[PDB]
DNA sequence: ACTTGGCCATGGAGTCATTTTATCTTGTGACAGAAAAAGTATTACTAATATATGTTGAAAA
DNA sequence: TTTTCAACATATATTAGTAATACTTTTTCTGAAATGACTCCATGGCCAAGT
Protein backbone atom coordinates (compact mmCIF):
# COMPACT_ATOMS: atom_id res chain seq x y z
CA UNK A 1 0.00 0.00 0.00
CA UNK A 2 2.59 2.41 1.29
CA UNK A 3 5.38 1.49 -1.05
CA UNK A 4 3.33 2.76 -4.40
CA UNK A 5 0.86 5.30 -2.84
CA UNK A 6 2.84 7.11 -0.86
CA UNK A 7 2.83 7.98 2.97
CA UNK A 8 1.83 11.74 1.91
CA UNK A 9 -0.25 11.77 -1.32
CA UNK A 10 -2.72 14.27 0.17
CA UNK A 11 -0.83 16.98 -0.80
CA UNK A 12 1.09 15.68 -3.79
CA UNK A 13 -1.87 14.28 -5.94
CA UNK A 14 -4.16 17.45 -5.11
CA UNK A 15 -1.17 19.35 -6.51
CA UNK A 16 -0.43 17.21 -9.14
CA UNK A 17 -4.42 16.93 -10.23
CA UNK A 18 -4.08 20.84 -10.17
CA UNK A 19 -1.44 21.47 -12.66
CA UNK A 20 -2.52 18.77 -14.83
CA UNK A 21 -6.15 19.68 -14.55
CA UNK A 22 -7.68 22.50 -13.10
CA UNK A 23 -5.81 24.71 -15.25
CA UNK A 24 -7.07 23.64 -18.51
CA UNK A 25 -10.31 24.14 -16.40
CA UNK A 26 -9.92 27.88 -15.03
CA UNK A 27 -9.05 28.75 -18.59
CA UNK A 28 -11.62 27.27 -20.46
CA UNK A 29 -14.18 29.47 -17.68
CA UNK A 30 -12.69 32.67 -19.06
CA UNK A 31 -10.80 32.62 -22.14
CA UNK A 32 -11.93 35.26 -23.79
CA UNK A 33 -11.43 38.84 -22.39
CA UNK A 34 -12.65 41.35 -24.64
CA UNK A 35 -13.21 45.16 -24.08
CA UNK A 36 -16.43 47.49 -25.18
CA UNK A 37 -14.59 49.05 -28.33
CA UNK A 38 -13.01 48.05 -31.49
CA UNK A 39 -15.96 45.44 -32.13
CA UNK A 40 -12.95 43.50 -34.07
CA UNK A 41 -10.65 41.76 -31.15
CA UNK A 42 -10.38 39.09 -28.94
CA UNK A 43 -7.53 37.18 -26.74
CA UNK A 44 -8.41 33.61 -26.59
CA UNK A 45 -6.52 31.34 -24.78
CA UNK A 46 -6.19 27.85 -25.34
CA UNK A 47 -3.74 25.54 -23.16
CA UNK A 48 -2.21 25.95 -19.86
CA UNK A 49 1.81 24.33 -19.11
CA UNK A 50 4.19 24.79 -15.91
CA UNK B 1 -45.47 46.90 -52.74
CA UNK B 2 -41.71 48.83 -51.30
CA UNK B 3 -42.47 52.03 -53.62
CA UNK B 4 -46.40 51.80 -53.71
CA UNK B 5 -46.98 51.11 -49.95
CA UNK B 6 -44.05 53.19 -49.41
CA UNK B 7 -45.59 55.73 -51.34
CA UNK B 8 -49.37 55.91 -49.89
CA UNK B 9 -47.96 55.21 -46.59
CA UNK B 10 -45.85 58.19 -46.95
CA UNK B 11 -48.65 59.58 -48.28
CA UNK B 12 -50.74 59.14 -44.26
CA UNK B 13 -47.52 60.59 -42.85
CA UNK B 14 -46.96 63.73 -45.02
CA UNK B 15 -50.63 64.72 -45.15
CA UNK B 16 -51.56 64.08 -41.03
CA UNK B 17 -49.45 61.06 -40.08
CA UNK B 18 -52.19 61.00 -37.05
CA UNK B 19 -49.76 63.63 -35.47
CA UNK B 20 -46.58 62.61 -33.36
CA UNK B 21 -49.52 59.99 -31.43
CA UNK B 22 -49.83 57.65 -34.43
CA UNK B 23 -49.59 54.22 -33.41
CA UNK B 24 -49.66 50.76 -35.46
CA UNK B 25 -53.20 50.21 -34.46
CA UNK B 26 -53.99 53.88 -36.11
CA UNK B 27 -52.60 52.19 -39.08
CA UNK B 28 -55.00 50.19 -39.46
CA UNK B 29 -57.67 52.99 -37.95
CA UNK B 30 -56.54 54.42 -41.77
CA UNK B 31 -54.96 51.38 -43.67
CA UNK B 32 -56.56 48.22 -42.55
CA UNK B 33 -56.48 46.69 -45.89
CA UNK B 34 -52.60 45.54 -45.67
CA UNK B 35 -52.01 42.18 -43.90
CA UNK B 36 -50.22 41.77 -40.86
CA UNK B 37 -46.78 41.06 -42.39
CA UNK B 38 -47.58 43.08 -45.39
CA UNK B 39 -47.57 46.77 -43.63
CA UNK B 40 -44.57 45.49 -41.16
CA UNK B 41 -42.46 44.23 -43.84
CA UNK B 42 -42.66 47.34 -45.49
CA UNK B 43 -42.74 48.81 -42.22
CA UNK B 44 -38.89 47.27 -41.32
CA UNK B 45 -37.67 48.04 -44.77
CA UNK B 46 -38.92 51.81 -45.07
CA UNK B 47 -37.15 52.34 -41.63
CA UNK B 48 -34.26 50.39 -42.91
CA UNK B 49 -34.73 52.45 -45.81
CA UNK B 50 -35.03 55.59 -43.59
CA UNK B 51 -38.69 56.48 -44.83
CA UNK B 52 -41.20 55.62 -41.61
CA UNK B 53 -39.93 57.00 -38.60
CA UNK B 54 -40.55 55.26 -34.89
CA UNK B 55 -40.69 57.35 -31.91
CA UNK B 56 -40.89 55.07 -28.64
CA UNK B 57 -43.23 56.48 -26.15
CA UNK B 58 -46.55 55.82 -24.16
CA UNK B 59 -48.23 52.19 -25.61
CA UNK B 60 -47.10 50.55 -28.85
CA UNK B 61 -44.46 52.87 -30.68
CA UNK B 62 -45.14 56.45 -32.73
CA UNK B 63 -44.54 56.77 -36.20
CA UNK B 64 -43.76 59.60 -38.59
CA UNK B 65 -42.89 60.54 -42.40
CA UNK B 66 -39.38 61.20 -42.88
CA UNK B 67 -38.12 64.73 -44.19
CA UNK B 68 -35.56 62.23 -45.90
CA UNK B 69 -32.75 64.74 -45.32
CA UNK B 70 -32.74 62.99 -41.78
CA UNK B 71 -32.76 60.21 -43.37
CA UNK B 72 -29.72 60.09 -45.72
CA UNK B 73 -28.12 62.12 -42.78
CA UNK B 74 -28.26 59.47 -40.18
CA UNK B 75 -27.62 56.91 -42.77
CA UNK B 76 -24.17 59.12 -43.07
CA UNK B 77 -23.61 58.58 -40.03
CA UNK B 78 -22.29 55.81 -38.37
CA UNK B 79 -23.89 52.41 -35.88
CA UNK B 80 -23.40 54.44 -33.01
CA UNK B 81 -24.92 57.67 -33.44
CA UNK B 82 -27.56 56.21 -35.42
CA UNK B 83 -29.47 55.47 -32.17
CA UNK B 84 -27.18 57.86 -30.36
CA UNK B 85 -27.90 60.60 -32.25
CA UNK B 86 -31.70 59.23 -33.25
CA UNK B 87 -32.06 59.17 -29.14
CA UNK B 88 -30.17 62.37 -28.72
CA UNK B 89 -32.62 64.29 -31.56
CA UNK B 90 -35.40 62.56 -29.73
CA UNK B 91 -34.61 64.62 -26.31
CA UNK B 92 -36.81 67.52 -27.71
CA UNK B 93 -36.60 71.29 -26.86
CA UNK B 94 -34.48 70.54 -23.16
CA UNK B 95 -31.95 68.49 -24.81
CA UNK B 96 -30.47 65.43 -22.76
CA UNK B 97 -27.22 65.22 -20.89
CA UNK B 98 -24.12 63.54 -21.19
CA UNK B 99 -23.35 60.57 -18.71
CA UNK B 100 -26.67 59.95 -18.43
CA UNK B 101 -26.50 58.24 -21.91
CA UNK B 102 -23.83 55.47 -21.03
CA UNK B 103 -26.80 54.37 -18.67
CA UNK B 104 -29.34 54.51 -21.05
CA UNK B 105 -27.01 53.20 -24.52
CA UNK B 106 -24.58 50.89 -22.62
CA UNK B 107 -21.36 52.13 -24.08
CA UNK B 108 -18.11 54.44 -22.31
CA UNK B 109 -17.46 57.49 -22.23
CA UNK B 110 -14.75 57.12 -24.51
CA UNK B 111 -16.85 55.48 -27.27
CA UNK B 112 -19.71 58.46 -27.19
CA UNK B 113 -17.02 61.22 -26.87
CA UNK B 114 -15.70 61.47 -30.66
CA UNK B 115 -19.04 60.77 -32.21
CA UNK B 116 -20.55 63.55 -30.10
CA UNK B 117 -17.36 65.66 -31.70
CA UNK B 118 -18.23 64.82 -35.22
CA UNK B 119 -21.71 65.82 -34.39
CA UNK B 120 -20.07 69.03 -33.50
CA UNK B 121 -18.56 68.71 -36.57
CA UNK B 122 -21.64 68.03 -38.43
CA UNK B 123 -23.13 70.93 -36.48
CA UNK B 124 -26.41 68.92 -35.48
CA UNK B 125 -25.61 69.43 -31.66
CA UNK B 126 -24.25 72.00 -29.71
CA UNK B 127 -22.88 72.04 -25.92
CA UNK B 128 -25.48 73.93 -24.09
CA UNK B 129 -24.76 75.27 -20.60
CA UNK B 130 -27.97 75.90 -18.70
CA UNK B 131 -29.03 77.69 -15.01
CA UNK B 132 -28.23 74.19 -13.63
CA UNK B 133 -24.84 73.89 -12.69
CA UNK B 134 -21.80 74.12 -15.47
CA UNK B 135 -20.62 70.77 -14.91
CA UNK B 136 -23.40 68.92 -17.30
CA UNK B 137 -22.61 70.05 -20.78
CA UNK B 138 -26.32 68.85 -21.43
CA UNK B 139 -26.43 68.39 -25.34
CA UNK B 140 -29.79 69.29 -27.89
CA UNK B 141 -29.84 69.67 -31.62
CA UNK B 142 -28.33 72.64 -32.70
CA UNK B 143 -31.26 73.33 -34.58
CA UNK B 144 -32.39 74.86 -31.34
CA UNK B 145 -31.81 76.80 -28.59
CA UNK B 146 -34.58 76.55 -26.07
CA UNK B 147 -34.53 75.91 -22.22
CA UNK B 148 -35.58 77.43 -19.16
CA UNK B 149 -33.80 80.59 -18.99
C1' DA C 1 -78.96 62.84 41.33
C1' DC C 2 -76.81 57.90 38.42
C1' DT C 3 -74.70 55.13 33.90
C1' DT C 4 -71.71 55.53 29.41
C1' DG C 5 -67.99 56.90 26.46
C1' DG C 6 -64.07 58.59 25.72
C1' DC C 7 -59.63 59.71 27.20
C1' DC C 8 -55.15 60.04 29.11
C1' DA C 9 -51.95 58.39 32.10
C1' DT C 10 -49.52 54.40 33.86
C1' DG C 11 -48.13 49.59 34.54
C1' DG C 12 -46.60 45.42 32.57
C1' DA C 13 -44.28 42.69 28.62
C1' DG C 14 -42.52 41.06 25.04
C1' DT C 15 -40.01 43.45 22.22
C1' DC C 16 -34.63 44.56 20.77
C1' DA C 17 -28.70 45.19 22.09
C1' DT C 18 -23.13 45.69 25.03
C1' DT C 19 -19.34 43.66 27.36
C1' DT C 20 -16.88 40.26 29.58
C1' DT C 21 -15.42 35.08 29.13
C1' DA C 22 -6.71 33.12 32.63
C1' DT C 23 -1.64 33.61 32.65
C1' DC C 24 4.16 33.63 31.20
C1' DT C 25 5.44 32.12 27.50
C1' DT C 26 7.61 33.74 22.50
C1' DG C 27 8.39 35.02 17.61
C1' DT C 28 6.13 37.15 14.71
C1' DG C 29 3.79 40.89 10.83
C1' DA C 30 -7.45 59.24 -1.81
C1' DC C 31 -12.70 60.34 -8.85
C1' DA C 32 -13.22 61.87 -13.13
C1' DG C 33 -14.15 65.08 -16.57
C1' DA C 34 -13.11 69.35 -18.16
C1' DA C 35 -10.57 73.96 -18.74
C1' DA C 36 -7.20 76.18 -19.37
C1' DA C 37 -2.16 76.78 -19.34
C1' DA C 38 1.60 75.53 -20.80
C1' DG C 39 4.47 73.36 -23.34
C1' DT C 40 6.32 70.69 -27.09
C1' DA C 41 5.95 68.13 -31.92
C1' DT C 42 5.63 69.19 -36.92
C1' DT C 43 6.11 70.97 -41.14
C1' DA C 44 9.81 73.46 -44.54
C1' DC C 45 14.71 74.44 -45.21
C1' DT C 46 20.82 73.30 -46.33
C1' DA C 47 23.82 70.35 -44.42
C1' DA C 48 28.17 68.46 -43.50
C1' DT C 49 28.44 63.64 -42.15
C1' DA C 50 28.58 57.93 -40.42
C1' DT C 51 25.82 54.32 -39.63
C1' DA C 52 21.65 51.48 -40.29
C1' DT C 53 18.00 49.27 -43.19
C1' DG C 54 16.60 47.41 -47.28
C1' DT C 55 15.88 45.95 -51.62
C1' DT C 56 17.05 44.93 -55.18
C1' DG C 57 19.36 44.04 -58.06
C1' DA C 58 22.85 43.65 -60.63
C1' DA C 59 26.61 41.67 -61.34
C1' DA C 60 29.76 37.91 -60.26
C1' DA C 61 30.47 32.78 -59.07
C1' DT D 1 21.63 30.37 -57.61
C1' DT D 2 24.28 32.80 -54.45
C1' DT D 3 27.04 36.35 -53.00
C1' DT D 4 29.31 40.42 -54.13
C1' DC D 5 28.68 44.96 -54.57
C1' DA D 6 26.84 48.45 -54.61
C1' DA D 7 24.10 51.59 -54.94
C1' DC D 8 20.56 53.83 -53.81
C1' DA D 9 17.66 55.79 -50.85
C1' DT D 10 16.78 57.13 -46.60
C1' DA D 11 16.58 58.67 -41.60
C1' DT D 12 19.81 60.19 -38.61
C1' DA D 13 21.34 65.10 -34.18
C1' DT D 14 22.78 70.59 -35.27
C1' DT D 15 20.94 75.22 -36.01
C1' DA D 16 17.71 78.66 -36.17
C1' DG D 17 14.31 80.89 -38.10
C1' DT D 18 9.23 80.60 -38.42
C1' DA D 19 3.51 80.02 -37.64
C1' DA D 20 0.58 77.16 -37.36
C1' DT D 21 -1.52 73.32 -35.99
C1' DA D 22 -2.01 69.86 -33.20
C1' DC D 23 -1.40 67.21 -28.85
C1' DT D 24 -0.64 65.94 -25.11
C1' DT D 25 0.46 66.62 -20.15
C1' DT D 26 -0.03 69.51 -16.14
C1' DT D 27 -2.93 72.46 -12.60
C1' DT D 28 -7.46 73.39 -10.56
C1' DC D 29 -12.80 72.37 -9.61
C1' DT D 30 -16.72 70.28 -8.78
C1' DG D 31 -21.16 65.91 -9.72
C1' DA D 32 -23.17 33.35 24.90
C1' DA D 33 -25.85 36.26 29.24
C1' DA D 34 -27.74 39.56 30.99
C1' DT D 35 -29.38 43.88 31.91
C1' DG D 36 -30.50 48.32 29.35
C1' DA D 37 -34.47 50.54 26.93
C1' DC D 38 -38.83 50.65 23.84
C1' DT D 39 -42.86 50.20 22.42
C1' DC D 40 -47.18 48.12 22.75
C1' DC D 41 -51.32 47.08 25.36
C1' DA D 42 -54.97 47.29 29.27
C1' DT D 43 -56.82 49.24 33.15
C1' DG D 44 -57.97 53.23 36.43
C1' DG D 45 -59.78 57.00 36.84
C1' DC D 46 -61.76 61.25 35.69
C1' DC D 47 -64.60 64.31 33.18
C1' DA D 48 -68.90 64.64 30.65
C1' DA D 49 -74.08 64.11 28.74
C1' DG D 50 -78.36 61.46 28.92
C1' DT D 51 -81.03 59.70 32.49
Request: charged share 25%; net charge positive.
Amino acid sequence: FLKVKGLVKQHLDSFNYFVDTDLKKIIKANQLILSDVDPEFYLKYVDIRV
Amino acid sequence: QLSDNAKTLHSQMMSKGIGALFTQQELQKQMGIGSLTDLMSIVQELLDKNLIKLVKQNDELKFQGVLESEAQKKATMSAEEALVYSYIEASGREGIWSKTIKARTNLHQHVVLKCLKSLESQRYVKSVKSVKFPTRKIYMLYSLQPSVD
